[PDB]
Amino acid sequence: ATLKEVEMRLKSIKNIEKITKTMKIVASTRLSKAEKAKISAKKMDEAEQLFYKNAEKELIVAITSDKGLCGSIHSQLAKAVRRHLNDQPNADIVTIGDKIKMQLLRTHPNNIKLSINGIGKDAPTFQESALIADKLLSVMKAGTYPKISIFYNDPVSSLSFEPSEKPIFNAKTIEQSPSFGKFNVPRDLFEYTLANQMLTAMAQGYAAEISARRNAMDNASKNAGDMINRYSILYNRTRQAVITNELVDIITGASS
Amino acid sequence: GEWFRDNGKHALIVYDDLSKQAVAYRQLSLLLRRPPGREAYPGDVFYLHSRLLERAAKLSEKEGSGSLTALPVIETQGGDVSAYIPTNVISITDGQIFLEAELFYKGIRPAINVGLSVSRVGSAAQVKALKQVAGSLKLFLAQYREVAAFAQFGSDLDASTKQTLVRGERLTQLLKQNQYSPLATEEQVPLIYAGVNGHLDGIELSRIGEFESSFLSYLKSNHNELLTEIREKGELSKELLASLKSATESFVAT
Amino acid sequence: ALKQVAGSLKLFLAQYREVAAFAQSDLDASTKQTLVRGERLTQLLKQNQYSPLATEEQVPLIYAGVNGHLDGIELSRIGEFESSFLSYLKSNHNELLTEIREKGELSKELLASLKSATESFVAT
Amino acid sequence: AEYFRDEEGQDVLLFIDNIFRFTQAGSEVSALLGRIPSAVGYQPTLATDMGLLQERITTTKKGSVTSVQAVYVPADDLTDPAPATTFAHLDATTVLSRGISELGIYPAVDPLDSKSRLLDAAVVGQEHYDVASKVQETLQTYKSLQDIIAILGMDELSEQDKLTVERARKIQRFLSQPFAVAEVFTGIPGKLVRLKDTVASFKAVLEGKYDNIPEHAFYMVGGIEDVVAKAEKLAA
């Protein structure tokens, strides 16, 4: 490549490295709160677990990141969840997050029946989650579903995550279970525990998104370095060549 | 051309191109065994192009008000403006129109790099109406050149930043032009007015080429007196601005 | 005398040179201590034009920086400390400065006396 | 060739391989003739030496001459004054590139440095011009996204940019073609494609009809019919 074009591409790469460094800084800032929230929600699920463990058509629920640059984890996990749920690919899907909406194409993309937006603008919380879930229950009869699959990323590692999904079910899932002897309370449960599991999955997904971004954006910044190095080597080799030609020019100028 | 200049007439001289002239003079100078300089050019190539270009002038009313305008062409090798002749000519001239191949292949023709292109005479040379409407155009394109590079990096962005892309892309599309089809300033003013003030924000980016084709046909057919005023007077009064806005919004309603 | 403390100073400055570049996300306690040390010492590395310092005076300052004493001072005042400290050393500890000049070594007695003086002034 | 043009009254083909060697020989003898070298060591008379030769090859009112000139590019440097001077004379120029043959593309012509004065809607028609412009625009967009792709990978492009990159890769491979002369060393039977078929195929590809086909199916096939046939063979 010509020296000028080399300079142009090298400047582009350097600018990209800077931008990715800034996004890495932002991700590392969010990381602490994200992990603490995920741990807190996982612990808080124990209240519903204490009953659900003893008591023991299709729908789709997607809870993923609102924006890209979340590494491959955010979109790939939801895509794999859709591929696994493709045993009933026509299930009505309620989609939260742009990445989850895109990953929904692994199943039938026309199954969409509800949508949400703005998940990425704030930390996970039940304040707006409750209103969104109430609108979802009004629009989709989620309170009577035999099996509605809600998928969210699992932060299995400090910098890694794996796909996960859970089925929300109607009151009859608890009221009809033979083990219920260990204890419309069932419908109050199908509301409260449904919302609690939704919040826990949302917090886990947020923690996974932030960890994956903190890892992947730093990986991008590190990858920038190798190509920048080799292009710097090429640039300096070109500088050597042009310097040699300039020396030749002045030598031929002096000799005559 | 200096005959036209000195007899009170106006002339435009294009040199296509001065680099080949410098090559020819370098040939002459080296076959005469004059001392070579940088790139084996002789010492006085700057004196050459300078005493050539300094002949472009605007003469006073006492001298006959004649003028000669020079558009020297220069061919850079791989965009290397650091070369000897490009440096000399860029130093001598009162400005530059800079053409880039990457813009050409992105479909931006006539490929003028609005960032590098500079006119040192500036707005004093511009027609008053186009000076009026085009006031913010440079600012929006300057913002766009940065924000587009930011956006291609893949970062999500706020709506205020997105608006910069919305107008910048459509302005860059609006400045495209077909060869051998120059537009009268009468016809340019409405297009820049529509683009700058955001009326095009509602048009699909790919369809902008249709708008510029149809809008003028509307103005020529339904608002001909407005165009006649823009041409004859060359400046926009408050009433002409109001009428132009009315016509622009009437058409954009589609 | 200067070597004894500067050999330790090098280590802290290198550690800060690493940590600050890393941190530029809460800091671990050791890294926070490293940052405090590094910037407090940087406030000693700064010096005014045409204002050279004798070794008798460099040694106590680098001593207060190395042993972490002046970590008890807000950095934005270290300069005001550094001068007054020396003046205090001129009044209450002249023997220590004279011994640093004459012998050029921080003997155990002189080293402990300097520690005592630094503690006294930092408390003051 | 001039005798055939002027006095036989005939259309003439004048292949020249390789006209850089004329300038190179002029350079080789230059120093012994006492001339002061210029630039990177070429003779001062380079420009006029090329001119007195090239302006003779021209078509005239007595006859038509079609001249194909192979031009060497020393050290792959298109800024070297010899090819840089040669560019000014030609009407149609196609730049073969090492960086493209390194991808296994043949004839390895660079689609964003080849240019011809006939690529004009008044000459080739509107359909041809639009197809060619869209092809070049797509390839240029892909070239501009090369570095971002290398950094972040395809997973982080916008849907529009991802589709553009995929279509650009398919277009780039579809530009390859096996020549009969190359059968000896490529091992692939030669193909010859009409201009109409070329325009229609690239229009169809740009319209997205064939976007479901794998990239590998577009490589070194010929027309779009061969793309479909090779897609069938690869699927089996």
* Three-state secondary structure of C65-103: HHCCHHHHCCHHHHHHHHHHHHHHHHHHCHHHHHHHHHH
Task: Classify residue D67 by its DSSP letter.
Answer: E
Tell me the residue type at C105: E
Same domain, A208 and A122: yes
Question: What is the rounded distance in angstroms from the CA atom of residue B18 to the CA atom of residue B86?
Answer: 9
State the DSSP string of B145-203.
HHHHHHHHTT----HHHHHHHHHHHHHHHHT---TT----HHHHHHHHHHHHTTGGGGS
Same domain, A168 and A83: yes
Same domain, A81 and A205: yes
Which chain A residues in 32-61 lie under 8 Å from chain C, judged by CB atoms? Answer: 32
B200: left (phi over 0), alpha (psi -120 to 50) or beta: alpha
Question: Among this protein's residues, is B231 annotated catalytic?
Answer: no
Question: What is the rounded distance in angstroms from the CA atom of residue D68 to the CA atom of residue D94?
Answer: 11
CA distance D225 to chain A (A): 30
- DSSP, collapsed to helix, strand or coil, labels residue B15 as strand
Which residues make Cβ contacts (< 8 Å) with residue A43, sequence separation at least 6? Answer: none
Question: What is the rounded distance in angstroms from the CA atom of residue B115 to the CA atom of residue B146?
Answer: 11
Residue A111 φ/ψ, nearest 5 degrees? -75, -5
Number of B:D CB contacts under 8 A? Answer: 55
Measured in whole angstroms, the distance separating CA A120 from the mean position of its chain's CA atoms is 10
Q: Does D146 touch chain B (CB under 8 A)?
A: no
Resolution of the entry in angstroms: 3.3
Residue with tokens 């949508």: A115
- Residue D84's alpha-carbon distances to B128, C33, D186, D199, in angstroms, are 42, 63, 32, 31
Same domain, A34 and A9: no
In 3D space, the residue among B97, B122, B90 whose CA is nearest the CA of residue B111 turns out to be B97
Same domain, A208 and A138: yes
A72:D155 CB<8 A: yes
Question: What is the rounded distance in angstroms from the CA atom of residue B154 to the CA atom of residue B150?
Answer: 8
Question: CB–CB of D169/D208 below 8 Å?
Answer: no
* Token reading at D202: 């690239």
Within 10 A of A256 (CB to CB), how many other CB atoms are there? 12
Tell me the residue type at B198: G
Which residue among the candidates B5, B26, B120, B167 is catalytic per the annotation?
Answer: B120
Same domain, A133 and A234: no
Question: What is the rounded distance in angstroms from the CA atom of residue B121 to the CA atom of residue B132?
Answer: 17
Q: Does A13 touch chain D (CB under 8 A)?
A: yes
Question: What is the rounded distance in angstroms from the CA atom of residue B224 to the CA atom of residue B218?
Answer: 9
CA distance C91 to chain A (A): 50
Which residues make Cβ contacts (< 8 Å) with residue A122, sequence separation at least 6? Answer: A128
Same domain, A10 and A32: no
Question: CB–CB of A37/A211 below 8 Å?
Answer: no
Contacting residues of D for A102, CB less than 8 Å apart: 159
B36:A253 CB<8 A: yes
Same domain, A14 and A131: no
D36:B152 CB<8 A: no
* Token reading at D207: 């319209």
Query: How many domains, chain A?
Result: 2
Number of A:B CB contacts under 8 A? Answer: 36
Question: Which domain range does residue A147 map to?
Answer: 26-216
Same domain, A212 and A235: no
Contacting residues of C for A32, CB less than 8 Å apart: 25-26
- DSSP, collapsed to helix, strand or coil, labels residue D16 as strand
* Token reading at B50: 């300078």
Question: CB–CB of A22/A221 below 8 Å?
Answer: no
Q: Inter-axis angle of helices B238-252 and B208-222, to 10 degrees?
A: 120
- Estimate the share of chain C in helix, then strand, then coil, as percent rounded to the nearest 5: 80, 0, 20
Angle at the Cα of B24 (from B19 to B30), degrees rounded to 5?
120
For chain A, the residue count is 256
* Token reading at D165: 């990159």
State the DSSP string of A17-40.
HHHHHHHHHHHHHHHHHHHHHHHH
A29:C25 CB<8 A: yes
Question: What is the rounded distance in angstroms from the CA atom of residue B96 to the CA atom of residue B89?
Answer: 10
In 3D space, the residue among D75, D7, D4 whose CA is nearest the CA of residue D40 turns out to be D75
D112:B105 CB<8 A: yes
Question: What is the rounded distance in angstroms from the CA atom of residue A190 to the CA atom of residue A173?
Answer: 9
Same domain, A103 and A4: no
In 3D space, the residue among A153, A142, A148, A191 whose CA is nearest the CA of residue A167 turns out to be A148
Which technique was the structure solved with, according to the deposited record?
A: cryo-EM
Rg over alpha carbons for chain A, rounded to the nearest Å, is: 26
Question: CB–CB of D140/B105 below 8 Å?
Answer: yes
Which residues make Cβ contacts (< 8 Å) with residue D59, sequence separation at least 6? Answer: D65
- Residue A124's alpha-carbon distances to A201, A204, B124, in angstroms, are 10, 9, 57
What is the helix (H) or strand (E) element at residue A112, kind and residue range?
A: strand A112-116
**Nearest chain D residue to A217, by CA:** D152
Same domain, A69 and A153: yes
Say if strands A162-168 and A148-154 run parallel, antiparallel, or are unpaired.
antiparallel
Task: Classify residue A152 by its DSSP letter.
Answer: E
Question: What is the rounded distance in angstroms from the CA atom of residue B146 to the CA atom of residue A82?
Answer: 38
Q: Which residues of B touch A (CB under 8 A)?
A: 33, 35-40, 78-80, 149-150, 153-156
Same domain, A173 and A187: yes
Tally of helices (H runs) and strands (E runs) in chain B:
12, 4
Question: What is the rounded distance in angstroms from the CA atom of residue A239 to the CA atom of residue A242?
Answer: 5
Q: Does A72 touch chain B (CB under 8 A)?
A: no
In 3D space, the residue among A28, A96, A107 whose CA is nearest the CA of residue A67 turns out to be A96
